[PDB]
Amino acid sequence: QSMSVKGRIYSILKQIGSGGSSKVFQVLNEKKQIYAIKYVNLEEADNQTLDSYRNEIAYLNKLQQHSDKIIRLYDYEITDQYIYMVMECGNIDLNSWLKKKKSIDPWERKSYWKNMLEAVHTIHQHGIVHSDLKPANFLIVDGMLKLIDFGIANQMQPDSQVGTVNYMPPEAIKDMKISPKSDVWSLGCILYYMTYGKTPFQQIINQISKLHAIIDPNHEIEFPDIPEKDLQDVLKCCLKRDPKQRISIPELLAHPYVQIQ
Numbered sequence: 001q002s003m004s005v006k007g008r009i010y011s012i013l014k015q016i017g018s019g020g021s022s023k024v025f026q027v028l029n030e031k032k033q034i035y036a037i038k039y040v041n042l043e044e045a046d047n048q049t050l051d052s053y054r055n056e057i058a059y060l061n062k063l064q065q066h067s068d069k070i071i072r073l074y075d076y077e078i079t080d081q082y083i084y085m086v087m088e089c090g091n092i093d094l095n096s097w098l099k100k101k102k103s104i105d106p107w108e109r110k111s112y113w114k115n116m117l118e119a120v121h122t123i124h125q126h127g128i129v130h131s132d133l134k135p136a137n138f139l140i141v142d143g144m145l146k147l148i149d150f151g152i153a154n155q156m157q158p159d160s161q162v163g164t165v166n167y168m169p170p171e172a173i174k175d176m177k178i179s180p181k182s183d184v185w186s187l188g189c190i191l192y193y194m195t196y197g198k199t200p201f202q203q204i205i206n207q208i209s210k211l212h213a214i215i216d217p218n219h220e221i222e223f224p225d226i227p228e229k230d231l232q233d234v235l236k237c238c239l240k241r242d243p244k245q246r247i248s249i250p251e252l253l254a255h256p257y258v259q260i261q
C-alpha cells in the first residue's frame with residue numbers, strides 16, 4: 001500500500017505492532033530506505049491524553065541530540081485527527097529477542113547493560129523518571145539497544161502484554177515516593193533475567209503474593225553463584241528494597257562490571 005508524511009511518500013511493508021489506538025509500520029521511502037512510522041488516531045483523545053503525547057513527542061525530539069541510545073525520530077506530522085512519526089527501524093525489541101533466546105553471550109549482555117544504563121541516565125539528566133521500564137521499552141538496532149519510550153498514557157504489543165508487574169519496584173507499590181532509584185530496580189530485574197533466565201519473582205503465579213513478596217524484606221531474593229562475581233554484585237546492588245540503600249546510575253556507570261576488561 002502507501003502513505004504520506006510532510007509531503008514525502010512511504011510505502012508500507014508490514015505492521016509491526018498495535019495498542020492504545022495506534023499502529024507501528026515498517027515502510028520504505030522515495031530513496032528505498034527503510035523506516036518505522038508510528039500512527040496515532042486522536043479521534044477519542046481527551047485534552048490530557050493529547051498533552052501527554054505532545055509531551056513525549058517534544059522530549060523525544062529534544063533528547064535525540066543528547067544520546068544515540070535514544071531512538072532517532074526523523075520527522076513527524078501532527079494534526080487534530082492523527083499523528084505520524086517517522087522513526088529509525090529496529091530489528092527486534094528486547095522482550096521478543098529474549099523470549100526466543102536459549103542463553104546469552106555474557107559479552108552481548110554487558111554491552112546491552114551499558115546501553116540501557118546510558119539511555120536511562122540520559123532521560124534522568126533531563127528531569128524524567130520512567131518508573132515503568134520493561135524489556136519491551138528497549139529496541140535492538142545494529143547490535144545496540146535504544147530506548148523507545150519515556151512515560152505517557154502509553155502501551156504497545158507485537159503481533160507478552162503490559163502491567164506485567166515483575167519489573168515493578170517496591171516504592172511504586174507502597175505508593176498506594178517515586179524517584180530515579182525506581183529505574184534502577186526495573187533495570188536490575190531486566191539484568192537478573194538476562195543473567196538467571198527468569199525475573200526474580202517470575203515463579204510466583206499469584207499476582208498478589210507477587211506484590212506482597214516484592215515489598216517484603218523477610219522474603220529474600222536468591223542470587224545463585226556465577227563466574228562473573230561482579231555481575232552478581234551489580235544485581236545485589238540494584239535489587240535493594242529500600243531506594244536509599246539502592247545504587248545509582250552514575251555509580252553503575254563507574255562499576256567494575258561495565259568498566260573492567
Ligand SMILES: Cc1cc(N2CCOCC2)ccc1Nc1nc(NC2CCCCC2)c2[nH]cnc2n1
Pocket residue numbers: 016017018024026036071087088089090091092093096136139148156157158159
Ligand atoms: C521491525 C521490527 C520487528 C519487531 N518484531 C520482530 C518479531 O517479533 C515481534 C515484532 C519488533 C520491532 C521492530 N522494529 C521496530 N519496532 C518498533 N516496535 C514497536 C511496535 C511494537 C512493539 C515494539 C515497539 C519500533 N518502534 C519505533 N521504531 C521501531 N522499530
